[PDB]
A paper describes a structure:
Here we present rotamer inverted fragment finder–diffusion (Riff-Diff), a hybrid machine learning and atomistic modelling strategy for scaffolding catalytic arrays in de novo proteins. We highlight the general applicability of Riff-Diff by designing enzymes for two mechanistically distinct chemical transformations, the retro-aldol reaction and the Morita–Baylis–Hillman reaction. We show that in both cases, it is possible to generate catalysts that exhibit activities rivalling those optimized by in vitro evolution, along with exquisite stereoselectivity. High-resolution structures of six of the designs revealed near-atomic active site design precision.
We obtained crystal structures of the four designs: RAD13 (kcat = 3.8 × 10−5 s−1), RAD17 (kcat not determined), RAD32 (kcat = 1.1 × 10−2 s−1), and RAD36 (kcat = 6.2 × 10−5 s−1). The crystal structures agree with the design models, having backbone Cα RMSD values between 0.68 Å and 1.2 Å. The catalytic residues of RAD13 and RAD17 adopted the correct conformation with heavy-atom sidechain RMSD values of 0.42 Å and 1.09 Å to the design model and 0.89 Å and 1.2 Å to the catalytic geometry, respectively. Despite the near-atomic precision with which the tetrad was reproduced, RAD13 and RAD17 were more than 105-fold slower than RA95.5-8F. This indicates that precise positioning of catalytic sidechains is by itself not sufficient to design efficient biocatalysts, even when scaffolding catalytic arrays that are derived from highly active enzymes. RMSD is a popular metric for measuring how closely a designed active site aligns with the intended catalytic array, but it is agnostic to the geometric constraints of catalytic interactions. This could explain the discrepancy between the low RMSD in the active site of RAD13 and low catalytic activity and general poor predictiveness of sidechain RMSD for activity.
Numbering used by the authors: 1 to 200
Write the structure that this text describes.
């Protein structure tokens, strides 16, 4: 059912092109900030450390995970940083564990999107559907506290949200796309602003 869900994501991009183009440009800006802050191994280690020390906010982690995964060679580094974040989050607490868990999840999610898309416009369409999956995944974690805050538990909630997202009605995916455009604009504006100050 992924085909029909992509069709509803494309309608949202056609019905709000100015917002979707802003998100796509905010995504390339995150890629530039991370690419230009130094080598991909330098930035990833730096991004992991700042996240482990509670200095990267949730929006700056979203932006860094995108920027580190928008390069094929970066995908290997982003995957390495994902496992390091999970092994560091397991030996951490509070914000350290929480921030590194998001970092681990978002790195692998962005590598997945980047691998499953052939250009930036295919990425924007697929990311719209994953945004609905995340909301469905979040409610699953909110309804069930026992659900593992662990990376392996969030991904299972995401897969369950992704399966339910492919089969959602047209208007549900459509409205989720307009919200993605709205939220991604704010998140990436603050996230890139914060990555800029910390990485240079
Ligand atoms: Na870099």
């Amino acid at each position: 059912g992924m085909e029909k869900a992509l069709e509803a994501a494309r309608k949202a991009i056609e019905e709000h092109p100015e917002e979707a183009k802003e998100v796509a440009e905010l995504n390339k800006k995150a890629g530039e900030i991370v690419k230009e802050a130094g080598s991909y191994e330098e930035v990833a280690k730096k991004v992991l450390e700042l996240a482990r020390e509670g200095k990267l906010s949730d929006d700056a982690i979203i932006a860094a995970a995108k920027g580190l995964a928008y390069d094929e060679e970066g995908q290997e580094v982003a995957l390495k940083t994902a496992e390091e974040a999970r092994k560091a989050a397991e030996e951490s607490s509070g914000k350290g564990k929480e921030r590194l868990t998001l970092l681990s999840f978002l790195l692998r999610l962005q590598v997945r999107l980047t691998r499953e898309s052939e250009d930036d416009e295919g990425y924007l369409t697929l990311a719209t559907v994953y945004w609905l999956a995340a909301k469905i995944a979040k409610k699953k974690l909110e309804e069930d506290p026992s659900a593992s805050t662990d990376l392996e538990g969030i991904e299972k909630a995401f897969e369950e949200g992704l399966e339910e997202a492919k089969k959602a009605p047209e208007e549900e995916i459509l409205k989720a796309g307009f919200d993605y455009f709205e939220k991604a604009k704010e998140i990436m504006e603050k996230g890139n602003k914060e990555l800029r100050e910390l990485l240079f």
